[PDB]
Amino acid sequence: VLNKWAAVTKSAPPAAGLRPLARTVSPNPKLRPADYKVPYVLRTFIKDRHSSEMQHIENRGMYREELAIERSRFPRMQKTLTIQTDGSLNEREFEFAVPPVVMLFQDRLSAHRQRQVALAKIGKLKRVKSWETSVRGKESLNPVCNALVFPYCVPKKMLVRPRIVDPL
Amino acid sequence: TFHSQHRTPIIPQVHVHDEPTAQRIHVGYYLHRHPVVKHSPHPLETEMGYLLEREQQRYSRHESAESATAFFASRGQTIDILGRTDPNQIKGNFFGLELYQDAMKVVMQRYTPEKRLTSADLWQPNALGDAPPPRHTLHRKLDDFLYLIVQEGATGKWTIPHTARKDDESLRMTADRAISSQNSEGLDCYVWSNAPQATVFLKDDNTRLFIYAATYLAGRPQFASFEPKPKDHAWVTRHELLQYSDTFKSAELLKALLDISADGTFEA
Amino acid sequence: MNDIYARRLAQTSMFHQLMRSHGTLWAATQVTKEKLNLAFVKEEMMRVNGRRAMPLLIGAAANENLNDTHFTHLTEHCAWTESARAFAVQRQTPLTQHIASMGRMAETITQAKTASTSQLLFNEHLARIDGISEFEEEPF
Amino acid sequence: HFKKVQDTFWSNRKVLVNRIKSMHNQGTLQSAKDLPIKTINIKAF
Amino acid sequence: YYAEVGQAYETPSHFPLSYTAPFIYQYTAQCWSREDLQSYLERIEQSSGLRTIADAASRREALYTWWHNAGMNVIPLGVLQHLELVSRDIVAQNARKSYRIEQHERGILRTPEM
Amino acid sequence: HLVAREWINVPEMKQGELVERNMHFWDTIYNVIPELGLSYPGQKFQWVHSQEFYYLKKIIITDHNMNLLGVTPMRKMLVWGPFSYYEQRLRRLSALLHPDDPVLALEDPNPAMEDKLHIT
Amino acid sequence: INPSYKWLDVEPDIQKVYRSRCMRAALQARGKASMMVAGNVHYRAELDHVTEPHWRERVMRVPKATERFQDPNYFTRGLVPSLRPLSRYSYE
Amino acid sequence: MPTTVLYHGDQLGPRPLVILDHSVARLEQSATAVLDACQEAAKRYEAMLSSLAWDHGAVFVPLQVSIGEINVMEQSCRHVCAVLDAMDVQWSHVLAHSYGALVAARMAASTAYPHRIGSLLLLDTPLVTEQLVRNTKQREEIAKAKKDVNVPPAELSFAIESLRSALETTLPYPAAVDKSLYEDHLFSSASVFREKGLVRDEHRYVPVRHLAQVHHPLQLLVPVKQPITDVAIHREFFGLRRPAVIKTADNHEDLFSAKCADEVADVVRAWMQRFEPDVVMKRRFEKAAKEMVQLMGSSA
Amino acid sequence: MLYGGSRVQYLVQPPFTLHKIRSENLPPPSLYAERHDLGLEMQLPRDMHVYNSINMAIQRQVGGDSSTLGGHADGFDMGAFFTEQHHPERHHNSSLPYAKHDTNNVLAMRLFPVNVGVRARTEAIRIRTDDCLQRLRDADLCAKMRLPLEHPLPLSRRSQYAAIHRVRAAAHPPPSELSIVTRPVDRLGASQRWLPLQTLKPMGHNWSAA
Amino acid sequence: NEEKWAQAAMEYIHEKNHVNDARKRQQDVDQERSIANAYDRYSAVSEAKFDERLSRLIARMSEALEEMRNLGLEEALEEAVLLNSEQPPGHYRRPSLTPPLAGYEPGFGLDVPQLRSQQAEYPPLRRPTDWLEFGEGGADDFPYVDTHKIEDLTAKHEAQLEEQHGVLREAAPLTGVEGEGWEAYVALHRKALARQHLIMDLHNDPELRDKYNADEAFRAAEWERRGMGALSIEAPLERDLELHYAQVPAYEAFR
Amino acid sequence: QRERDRKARQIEKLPRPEALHDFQYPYEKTILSDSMFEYPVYETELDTPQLFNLTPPPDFFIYWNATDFDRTAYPPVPEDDHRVLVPSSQSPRWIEHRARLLQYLRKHEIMPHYVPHIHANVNLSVVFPGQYNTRARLTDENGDKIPPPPAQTKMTPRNFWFTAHCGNYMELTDVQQPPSVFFFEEAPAAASAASDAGEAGDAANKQSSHAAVNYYTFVMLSPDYPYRVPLLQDRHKADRGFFLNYMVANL
Amino acid sequence: LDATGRKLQKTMWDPVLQRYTLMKETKVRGPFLTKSNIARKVDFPVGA
C-alpha cells in the first residue's frame, strides 16, 4: 500500500461501493470447497446481466405484489379438444405444437369394452359373486397384517385369503 | 387419477365362520350416478380463467417460444417423429398417418357436440306445485349427482332399497347381493367401501340399517322386482331431496342420507 | 379454467375416495387412539394427492418411492387428469419426464430422442389420463 | 465462460460413457453405485 | 475481579452472605470501609429473602427487585453487582472443588498444582 | 444521484407557434434504464441497480403532490431533525472542502471548443 | 478437542490482566489462591468437564443432512434468524 | 319469501334469468295489492323479454322494504337467495333497474352469497357517483390524516372543509318509488355518516372498497341520449370495458319501448350467450372446426 | 395442496410478519462511531510513533474492525480466505480500493481536475489543504477570542497579541459583529487586490520513478 | 447429431427465475390482485360447505363402525374395516365438457389400427411394496405379510426418506408455497411412517399398550417423542387490510 | 486387486458430468428472505430513534418535493400511550413501561451515572405547549406575532411527541414555552390494603399530599451545557453541575 | 489456451480518469498513445 510519504503516490482508488467483488469459487481445485461440483447446468445463455445474476438467487418465498401462481415451471400449455371414443368431448392441454381437435382412439371405455369382450372369449365376462362365493378358503394366524395399507397398516390376528385371479 | 389396477391385488370379502347370532339388521344401498358433464362454470370463474391463462402464459417457462416445437425449431432440432420444424404443418398433419387425416376430415364436417342441457331440465311450473314430480329420467341433469329414493307400495313413504342380513354374510356381501338379486344381476353396481356409510336405529321395527353408497354404471333398475314392494322410484339430486321430506319415511334417515350424499356442487 | 374444473372434480372424489378409506383409517386410529376427524383425514388426504415433483435431474428426485403404494393409488383423487399443470406439479411435464432421464443418464440420448417425440408423448400421455397402460406383472 | 462449460459437458460426457463401456468391457463388473454418477444404468447402454 | 484472579474462596456455598464480605472488600476499599460492608451485607440478609451464597447466585433477579423497591437509598448497587460477581464464583469454584474431590475417589489423583 | 421529475414542461413549436407540451419524462428514464421494468423480488436491494449505469443509485423524483399522507419512509429521505448526537457532521466535513472546489456544472450553450462541455 | 491446533488470542485490555496477575501472583504468594483456575495449564483438561460434562458428544455428534440445512421456508417465515449451511464444524 | 313471481316463458330451465326491479312494496299489507304493484313493473319487462326468447325461462322476484334499520339489505339477499333455492338454481344471470340492483351488488360483493349471482346487468342504475367516490377516497386519507400527527393542520383543515363543502349526494334514484328508500334508509344523510363528512357508515348498503371488488362480469346498459349513470366513472371502477349503448333509446324508461325492446335484448342475449356453457361450447368447437380446416386448406 | 397442485385459492400471498427492533437494546450514542461512519479522506495512520499503527500485511482485512471482537472460534477454512483474500480479481490491478491507508487527501483527490498530472496534483491538493488548515485555525483562533472571523488573519493579529493564551470555552460574537465580509482588507474599509491561492497548470510531470 | 438434440433438449428443462412483466402496471397488477381475492371470497363458501360435509360424512362412518362393534359383529368389523382394493372399473367414467353422443364410434367408423395401439407408460412404477412380493423371499400371502417384515420395511424408509430428504434439501432447495408444500408432503410421510413405527412398538410390546391408553397427556407426550404432531394450516387473513409500510414488496414498485 | 483398485482409482479419475437442476445451493445460488431485506421497525419509537439511527430509503425512486421541508417528521403516535397510565405496582402495561423506561435511561448514559438511584415510581409526562412548528416566526398571512400557546390542559395524541419521554426529540421552537407537568402517582395508599385504617387517611388532612412524599418538586436541568460532551470524557475529568432550566415546587 | 479468438477485454479502474473503463489487450511492447489512438471528432448530443 502506498502512503503519503512515498516517492510516488497514486490518485483516488475506487470506493468499493461500485463494481463490487463477487464472492465466487476460485478456479483453483484446491481453493474450491468440497461439496462444490462443476456446474453443468445447461441453460440458454441469458445476455443482460440484470436477468443473468437473478438466477443465482432463490426468491420464491419473498413477498410479491402479484399473485403467487407457480411460475416458470409449467412450460406453456396449448389446449386442444380431445373427442373421446364415445364422443364425450373433454379438453386438455399440451406443451408442444398440438393441433386443434384431436380424434381419439383407444379410450378408457374402449379398453374396458375390449377387456370384457376378450373376457367374453373365456366367457368369464358376467361376474364373480361374493354371496355366491361360498368358497371359504381362509386361515387365521397370529403375527400377520395387511400389506396394501402399509402406511396405515395394523397388526393383529388376521384371517388370510387369496386374491382374485383375472385372466387378461 | 382413478388409475387402473396396476398390480394391486383384490382381497375379497368372505363368509364369516362364527355365527354371532345375527339380529335385526337391514342393508340398503344408496345408488347414485356419476356426473355426466363438468361443473357448470360460474361466470366469475370464467373471469378467473382469463386471469390464470394470462398469467400462466406470460410467465411461461420459455416466454417467447410459442411451444416446444417452436422452441426446438429455433435450433433446427426437432421433437416430432418425422422431423418437421415449421409447427404450422405439424398442426395440419400431426400424426404421420394419412388415414388419420381421412378420419378427421369426416368428423370436422359431421360432428356436432351434444347439448349439455337436457330438455328434461326445462322444468315447467304449469305441471304443478304439488308433491315432487315423477322424475324418472336418468338423463335428467348431467352436472349434478342423481340419487335413488324409492317409495314402497306399502305405506307410500320413500326408502332406499334395503334387505336383511343373513347369518354368515358380511355387510359388503349383503349389500352386493342386495342389488344384484333385486335386479336379477341386471345392474353394474360399484360399492365404494367394504363397510357401511351410515347407520340408523329404528324404534318401529327396532331395525338397524346400514347404508351403502354405490354408483350406477349400467343396468335397468327393474323396480317391481325390488324387495320393498316399491311404488315408483326417483332419481333426485342431493338438493331436491329436501322436497320429499314431507312424504319421506324417517326424519332420522333423511338427514342421515343428505350427510353421506355427495354433490357435484358443494354450494349447499 | 381447467384447474377450476379439476378442483371442483376432486371434491366429488375426495368425497368418495374417503368413503373407501375411512375404514382403514378407523382401524389405525383405534390403536394410536388419535382423533379421526377432519383434522386427521385432511392431513392424510394431502400426503397422498399433493406430491411436489422435484426437478427430476437429482436422481433422488426421480426416485420418489412413497406415492405409489397400494394405498396411495386408492385414496388418490383424479386431480392430475383435468389439467396438465396440476400434472406438472405431481409429476413433471410429459416431455421433461423423458429429457431428465437422459439428463441423469438413466436412458441414452438415442433412447430419449426417438421415444420422446411429440407423437409418442401424446398417445402415451393420454394413457395415464385414462389409466390404460402397460404393466410389468413381475417388476425387475 | 458459458460456452466453454456447456460444450465440455458433452465431451466430458462422451469421455465417461465411452470409457465406462470399455471399463465394463474389461470384465470390471461395475454396478450402478461404485461409479461417479449413480443414476446411470449401464444395461441401458 | 473474581473469576479471572482465581482466589481460593474456601466458603462453601451454603454459608450466609455475611461471609463473602472479606472477598468483596479487597476490590472495593477506597469505596466503603470494611465495617461498612458488614452493614450492607447484613441488611441484604435481613430484608431480602436471600441468605446464602448459593441463593444470591440463583436469585439475582429476585434480589435486585428487592434492592430496587426496598434498598436504593443505603446499599449502593455497586455492592450488589459485586455481591453477584462473587456469589457466581464461590458457587462456581465449589462446583470445581466438589468435582475435584469426587474424581479423586474415582482415581484421577492430581497434585495440589493439579 | 439523478434528480428528475415525472412531467417536464418542454416548449415546442406547433403551427410555427410556441406551445407548451407536458413531457412525460417517466418514459425517458425507463428507456434509459430497462432494468426498472424487469422487477424481481430482490432488485430494490440489488447492488448495482442498472449494470449499464452502475453510477446510478437513486433517482430523486421531485413532483409536487397534493395528497395529505406523503410518501412512506420506504421512498422518502428524512430531511428533518438532528441527524446526529454529538456534532452535526456537516460542519466537520464543512471544514475539509475548500472555497475553490466545484459546486456547480452549468451546461454550455456555445462551447469555446470541443472540450468545454460544461463549466464548473 | 485436539491440543495440536492452537489459536492466538490478543485480549485488548492490558490493565485487565496486569491488575489480576499482580493479584493472582500476590495471592498465591500468601498461599491463598486456588490452583483450579481456568488459566492453569494442567487443569484445562478437567476444567471443561466440570461445566460441560458431555462436550465430547457435542462435537462427536454427526448431524443429519436434514438439520444441517434447516427448512429454507423457516428462513422466509423468519423462524430461524439466518441459515448458515457451511458452518457445520464445532471448533471448540 | 314470496310466492308471487312472474315466470315469463313457459319453462324455467336450470338457471334462468332472475330479473329484479325496485323494492316493490312492503308486505306489511297483503300479498294481493303488492302483486298488482309488481304486475306493472313486469309491463316494462313483459315487452323486452318477449324479443329475447330465452331458452331457460325468465323470473321476476319482488323485494320488501324493512320494518327496521339494517333489515333492508340482508333481508332482500336471503330473500332472493331463497327464491333461488325454491327453484333449484344457483348462478342465475340477473337484470336490474333500481334497488333491485344494489341487492345484486350487495350479494355479489359480500361473502356468504357470491355464488348466487352469476352475471349482473345494469339497466340505468348508477352504483357509484363521482361525488361519492372522489369523496370516499379522501375519507380514507383523512382517516389517516386525522390520526397521524406530522400533518400540518392548515392542509388538514382545508381537506376537511373541501370534503363537506363538496359532500356526497344520494345515489340518483332510477325510478319514483324507492325515492323514499334511496333517501330514507340507504342514504339517510343524517345517519349514514357521523362526524359529518368524515366517516360514513357504509355497512348498510356496501363499503365502497367492496364495490372495488365485484368482478362478477358486469355490464351497464345506457340510452345514447342524456342518461343517468354517466359512463365515464363506471368504466374506471368496474374495469375497462365499454358499456354497450342502446343507440336508439333516448333516456331511461325508453329502453322498454318498442324502439329498443329488440336490441336491449339483442345485446343482453349476447351477454347470456357469454356464460351459458352450451353456447360458448358451440362457438368453441365450431371455432376449432374453422381452425382445423385452415390446416387442410394449406396441405397443398 | 390436497388438490393435486392446482393452485387456485388464496393465490394472493399474505404479507410476511415484521421483525421489530427494540430501540432501547441499542448501543449508546457513540462519538467515535459518529465520526467514522461517514467515510472520508482518512484518519491519521493511528500512529505518530509507528508502534500500534497496523501492519501492511493485514491492511486489506480491516475497515470497521477498530471495534474489539467468525461464525465460530476460527479455522479460516482456507476458503473465502484465500478465495476472497486473493481473488482471481484484485490481482494484476494497480489501484486496490480505499482500504484504511492514509494516502493523499482522497476527499480532495475526488474534487480535483484530472487534467493536472500526478506529481503536480499531490503538490496541489496539499496547497488546497494547507489553506483549509489555515481557515480552520483562524476560526478556532478568532472564535475562541470572541472575535468575528478573519482570514488570512495577519501575523500581528495571529499570535493573538502573544497568542493571548485563550484567556486561560469558545463564544460567538454578538450578531452585531457578524457580517459576510471577512478579509481584513475588506473588514475595516490595505490594497483590496485579489489573487487565487494556487496556480493549477495542466502540465504533466516528466519524472516517473520507474 | 444426437448430442446436438440433447443439447437443445436439456435447454428445455431449465427453469429460470425470470422477471416480472415489464407491461404490468399498478393499475392492473392490483386488478388481478382484486380478482383473486374476489375468488377465494367466492370459493370459500364452496369450500366451507365441503369440509363441513366431511365433518358429517366422517361422523356417519365412525358411528357406523362403532355400532357394528356393539351389535356383536366383531369379526364382521375385521372384514369390513378391510381396505376395499377393487379400483373403480374402466366402465367408471370421468365427466367431460359435453355428454356422450348417441351412438358414436371413433371417427364414425374411420378406424386407425395404429393410434388404437397398446403402448407404454413412463416411468416404470416401482413401489415400496415391490421389495416384498416381486422380490426375493417371495411372500406367498403377499397382502398379508408377516408383521416383522413391516417393522423392517418401515424401518427401511425412515432410513431412506431421511436420506432422500437430506439431498433434496441441499441439492434441490425451494421456498415459498411450493416449499411449504414440499415440507408438508415430506413431514406428512415422516409422520405417517412414524405412526407405523408406533403401532408396531405399540403392538409387539405388551407393556406399553396399557399405560399408553391409560391417559391423554402421555400420548400427547409420546406422540411428541415420535415426531408426530398436528399440522396447522395457515389461516387465510383474506380480509381487506392495509399492510404496514415496511411489508411492501422487496422490489421496485410497478408503474 | 492391484489393477482393479487402480481401475477403481480410474473411476475416480473418470470425469463426473452430472447436469444439475440449477446452481449448487450454498456456493452459487443463494436464498433471500424477508428478514434480510426489511426496513427497521422499532417496536416502540419513544426515543425517537428514526431521527438518529438513519437508514437509507431502500427504494430506487426517492420522492422528495420542496413542501416536505415544512412537515415535522415526528414518529407516528403509539396507541396505549404511556402518559395516561397510572403507576400502580400490578398494572401489566406499567411493569412493561417501568423497565422500558429504565431500559432507555441506561442506553443514554443517564441511569447509572448522572442519576444513580432512580426510584421509578410515578408516571411523569411533561407536556409542552406545542404547535408542530418548523421554526420560530410570526404568523405568515396575519402579519402578527404568534400568540404563545396556552398551558397544556389535557394529554392527547397531538401532545404526545411534545412530552418528556425516554430520550425523544423536540424542536426547540416548541419548548420555548414553560412546560405543563402531568404526573400521576399511585404509591400512597391508606395501608398495605388501604384497610384497617378505620377512617385513617381521612384523618390525614392533606390527602392529595397527606404522605411525606406527595408534595412533588419538578426540577429540570440539562447536563450538556454548552454542548453535548461524551460521557467518557466528562464523566471523569470535570466536576460541574447542570444547567438548571426550571424548578416548580409544592406540586 | 486459445479459448478467446477475440482480443481480451476487461473493465479496470483507469487511474488517470479515476473511472472504470475498458481495457483492450495489446502487446506489452509499444507506444501506448499513437496517432492510431486518435478518435474521430464527433458532435455530442449536447450543446446547441
Side-chain angles (χ1 to χ4, degrees), chain D residues 9-42:
Chain D
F9 163 72
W10 287 123
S11 69
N12 190 283
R13 178 188 166 284
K14 186 168 73 177
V15 157
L16 169 65
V17 309
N18 274 96
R19 275 168 151 166
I20 200 167
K21 277 178 192 283
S22 45
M23 293 164 207
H24 156 86
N25 191 12
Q26 316 285 66
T28 303
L29 183 147
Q30 292 294 259
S31 42
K33 187 46 204 63
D34 45 309
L35 74 92
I37 74 163
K38 322 304 179 187
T39 322
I40 179 181
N41 54 341
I42 295 196

Side-chain angles (χ1 to χ4, degrees), chain I residues 57-117:
Chain I
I58 65 168
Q59 204 149 30
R60 310 322 310 185
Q61 31 193 342
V62 282
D65 297 356
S66 89
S67 79
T68 67
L69 172 70
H72 48 80
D74 206 326
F76 70 77
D77 185 288
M78 210 174 73
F81 170 80
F82 268 26
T83 301
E84 191 96 340
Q85 266 328 296
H86 35 63
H87 202 201
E89 196 30 86
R90 293 285 159 274
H91 198 31
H92 305 121
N93 267 326
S94 282
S95 67
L96 293 201
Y98 194 66
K100 232 195 184 171
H101 57 239
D102 57 83
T103 184
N104 318 125
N105 176 336
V106 183
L107 186 56
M109 281 305 205
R110 263 64 185 254
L111 299 170
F112 267 184
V114 304
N115 213 353
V116 178

Side-chain angles (χ1 to χ4, degrees), chain J residues 86-239:
Chain J
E86 47 181 6
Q87 203 90 48
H91 199 193
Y92 204 51
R93 196 176 101 87
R94 161 182 65 256
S96 89
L97 269 61
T98 64
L101 291 186
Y104 166 92
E105 286 291 329
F108 315 122
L110 270 296
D111 290 315
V112 174
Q114 300 80 245
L115 277 73
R116 63 158 45 97
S117 42
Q118 189 279 327
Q119 54 180 257
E121 55 89 12
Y122 199 81
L125 190 69
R126 73 190 57 78
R127 56 181 79 190
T129 79
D130 297 355
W131 293 88
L132 300 199
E133 211 278 352
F134 321 93
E136 66 275 20
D140 62 354
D141 320 328
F142 157 73
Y144 283 108
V145 291
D146 193 318
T147 78
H148 211 72
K149 201 173 288 295
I150 280 178
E151 305 163 20
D152 306 0
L153 162 68
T154 286
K156 171 170 67 179
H157 283 276
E158 63 102 21
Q160 196 250 334
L161 170 57
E162 280 177 352
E163 182 196 10
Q164 298 296 307
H165 192 26
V167 60
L168 277 172
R169 200 172 269 215
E170 62 151 2
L174 51 83
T175 81
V177 188
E178 55 276 18
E180 282 287 336
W182 156 257
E183 273 295 329
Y185 152 72
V186 163
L188 278 177
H189 269 84
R190 299 175 65 179
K191 154 153 191 164
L193 303 182
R195 93 176 75 248
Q196 195 68 36
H197 195 82
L198 172 62
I199 54 148
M200 296 320 169
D201 305 2
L202 203 57
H203 159 64
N204 51 36
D205 305 330
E207 179 276 321
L208 210 58
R209 188 187 288 94
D210 57 20
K211 189 176 44 56
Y212 185 87
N213 303 308
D215 68 288
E216 179 71 38
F218 179 48
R219 306 168 218 166
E222 179 43 53
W223 301 341
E224 191 62 29
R225 313 184 332 126
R226 296 301 169 110
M228 309 175 316
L231 187 39
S232 88
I233 289 299
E234 305 97 38
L237 184 43
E238 180 263 321
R239 299 303 96 62

Side-chain angles (χ1 to χ4, degrees), chain B residues 44 47-48 51, chain H residues 215, chain J residues 30-39:
Chain B
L44 205 164
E47 201 61 5
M48 189 71 181
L51 178 62
Chain H
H215 296 296
Chain J
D30 197 294
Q31 180 252 355
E32 80 159 359
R33 269 278 276 250
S34 276
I35 278 184
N37 268 338
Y39 182 102

Side-chain angles (χ1 to χ4, degrees), chain E residues 15-84:
Chain E
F15 278 22
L17 273 182
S18 168
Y19 292 163
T20 182
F23 309 121
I24 302 192
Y25 180 72
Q26 72 194 353
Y27 291 100
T28 61
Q30 306 296 329
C31 285
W32 322 292
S33 43
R34 166 176 271 105
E35 196 36 79
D36 211 326
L37 272 173
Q38 315 284 27
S39 160
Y40 305 157
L41 280 168
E42 65 91 28
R43 178 169 277 107
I44 292 179
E45 296 181 356
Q46 292 195 317
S47 318
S48 58
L50 271 63
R51 320 205 150 277
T52 44
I53 295 95
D55 216 359
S58 90
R59 303 243 290 161
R60 62 97 176 159
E61 174 177 59
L63 172 57
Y64 272 86
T65 52
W66 160 79
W67 174 78
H68 196 280
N69 297 328
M72 190 69 77
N73 53 60
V74 50
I75 295 104
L77 79 163
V79 174
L80 261 57
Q81 43 197 2
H82 260 283
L83 172 58
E84 210 275 349

Side-chain angles (χ1 to χ4, degrees), chain G residues 4 10 22-23 39 41 48 58 60 66 73 75 79 85:
Chain G
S4 158
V10 180
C22 87
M23 275 217 73
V41 42
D48 65 84
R58 200 195 72 262
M60 279 216 295
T66 86
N73 290 125
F75 182 31
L79 295 187

Side-chain angles (χ1 to χ4, degrees), chain I residues 27-42:
Chain I
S30 197
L31 166 60
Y32 185 83
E34 290 278 323
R35 298 215 199 83
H36 309 257
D37 61 48
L38 187 55
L40 252 51
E41 40 182 359
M42 206 48 230

